[PDB]
């Protein structure tokens, strides 16, 4: 199945979807009539092939001269998030689901673009320094201007946790120069190991009913959860608890036996981790209605994640903020103020109980589940929409 969760990052109206299309052919759709013209809310999904010519996009070597057929390397799946500074929660969720990143910078649009920088920062925070950098709108720029842009980018990427991350000049519309990108996908991104015995944990980003308009109820379908595994091969025929729960104010975890564990385009026996998977469960498709299973944790039955509202956070912050042009000073965190705490996939609205030296105690208005220590990206409301302040770990 899908071997490595590779994410796509860039500015809004630059062409992440376009890039995906160029790579795979699989469309992110762009939907709900708002997003048909403009920008997606959900993650965009695509399945790209790597079968190398060693003597590729398709498993045949008729194209690159030598008739010695395309030698199977990998199959990779995309994690394409919204690159808008309003919808950052989704991006954050994607980030602690990904194994590696793909940057997208346009030629004619500037080098210190705010959103892109923010994305980069997020990636750095959430252990995602494996970034393949792509020059995108180069089918517009001069023989000198492009070079200048590249130089500027290089200059920028000197103090960042990205040091010598590779840059490729592609056209997402004209279909050129993606060979290099493909090569890098095997070269610069090795897949981090993901075993059998590391306790099975599924991180849900999407809720899906496949209940088509027109059918009869004597021919029914269950609930499908679109979520990623980063530990534990889920096999067909297992019982599950989804632990952030269902709301009564108290919450109670949801129990579902596996109908299917579906990856690629064809349903499989297994779901080997480091991939984003559509899990058919006996759970109602009415709870998989639109975007209900977003930021929920799934464990195999006989397991104890903990649903915390009162949290011990170890926090770290910036000197100067991101999301804006206008990079504003980080004023100190203020008590009993609504922050957004992004933990793996959750985007919970939290109130500050205490501020110490490097630790903070937080109240959650919506309960999140901590199994391990859990990776956090933090966010705040200063300029209406949510800006990225810093990062944390749950000290548990």
């Amino acid at each position: 199945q899908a071997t490595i969760n590779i994410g796509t990052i860039g500015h809004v109206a630059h062409g992440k979807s376009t890039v995906v299309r160029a790579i795979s052919g699989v469309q992110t759709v762009r939907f709900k009539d708002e997003l048909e013209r403009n920008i997606t809310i959900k993650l965009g999904y695509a399945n790209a092939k790597i079968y190398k010519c060693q003597e590729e996009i398709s498993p045949k070597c008729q194209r690159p001269g030598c008739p010695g057929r395309y030698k199977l390397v990998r199959h990779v799946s995309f994690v394409d998030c919204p690159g808008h500074d309003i919808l950052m929660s989704t991006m954050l969720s994607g980030a602690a689901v990904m194994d590696a990143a793909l940057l997208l910078i346009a030629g004619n649009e500037s080098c210190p673009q705010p959103q892109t920088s923010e994305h980069l920062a997020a990636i750095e925070i959430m252990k995602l320094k494996h970034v393949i950098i792509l020059q995108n709108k180069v089918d517009l720029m001069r023989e000198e201007s492009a070079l200048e842009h590249q130089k500027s980018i290089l200059k920028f990427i000197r103090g960042t946790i990205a040091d010598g991350a590779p840059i490729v000049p592609i056209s997402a519309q004209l279909k050129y120069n993606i060979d290099a990108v493909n090569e890098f996908i095997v070269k610069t991104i090795p897949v981090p190991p993901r075993d059998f015995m590391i306790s099975p944990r599924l991180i849900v980003i999407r809720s899906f009913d496949v209940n088509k308009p027109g059918a009869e109820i004597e021919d029914l379908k269950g609930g499908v959860a679109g979520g990623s595994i980063l530990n534990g091969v889920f096999k067909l025929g297992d019982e599950i608890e989804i632990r952030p729960g269902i709301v009564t104010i108290q919450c109670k975890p949801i129990f579902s036996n596996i109908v299917s564990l579906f990856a690629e385009q064809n349903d499989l026996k297994f779901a080997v981790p480091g991939g984003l998977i559509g899990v058919g469960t006996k759970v109602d498709p009415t709870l998989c209605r639109a975007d209900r299973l977003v930021g929920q944790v799934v464990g195999a039955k006989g397991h104890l994640p903990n649903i915390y509202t009162d949290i011990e956070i170890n926090y770290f912050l910036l000197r100067r903020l991101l999301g804006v042009k206008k990079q504003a000073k980080v004023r100190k965190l203020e008590p009993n103020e609504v922050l957004m705490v992004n933990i793996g996939s959750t985007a919970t609205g939290a109130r500050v109980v205490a501020v110490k030296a490097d630790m903070a105690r937080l109240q959650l208005t919506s309960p999140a589940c901590t199994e391990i220590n859990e990776k956090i990206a933090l966010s705040r409301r200063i300029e209406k929409h949510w800006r990225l302040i810093g990062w944390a770990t749950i000290k548990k």
Partner: peptide, 17 residues
Amino acid sequence: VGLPYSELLSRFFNILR
């Protein structure tokens, strides 16, 4: 490195419509 990139860029420039 931005010089195994330079070659790529050159190639791209060569094969534009």
